[PDB]
Amino acid sequence: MNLNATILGQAIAFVLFVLFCMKYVWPPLMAAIEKRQKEIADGLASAERAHK
């Protein structure tokens, strides 16, 4: 359709949401999940240690 400068303004909007998502959103979410996965694994290890 109409060839337009919206391609350039949207490239600023795209980059800024990936920088803020990369720093702020993604490290804290993955921390919270993986910390829970470790708690479950430490539960497995604790059962084996009890019977030993």
Binding site: S46, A47, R49, A50, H51
Partner: protein, 52 residues
């Protein structure tokens, strides 16, 4: 499962230590019985041999 295991382990160990302590004191009762019988037949051996 780890908490309950600790309590019984302690309970088991206290039982085992109690029976072991009884067996050493029962061994001292056997010792003192054997020693008093040894003394009793040593006086009795002397008294019969001199009477003889």
């Amino acid at each position: 499962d780890l908490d309950l295991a600790k309590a019984s382990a302690t309970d088991q160990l206290k039982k085992a230590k109690a029976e072991a302590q009884v067996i050493i004191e029962q061994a001292n009762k056997r010792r003192s019985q054997i020693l008093d019988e040894a003394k009793a037949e040593a006086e009795q051996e002397r008294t019969k041999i001199v009477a003889q």
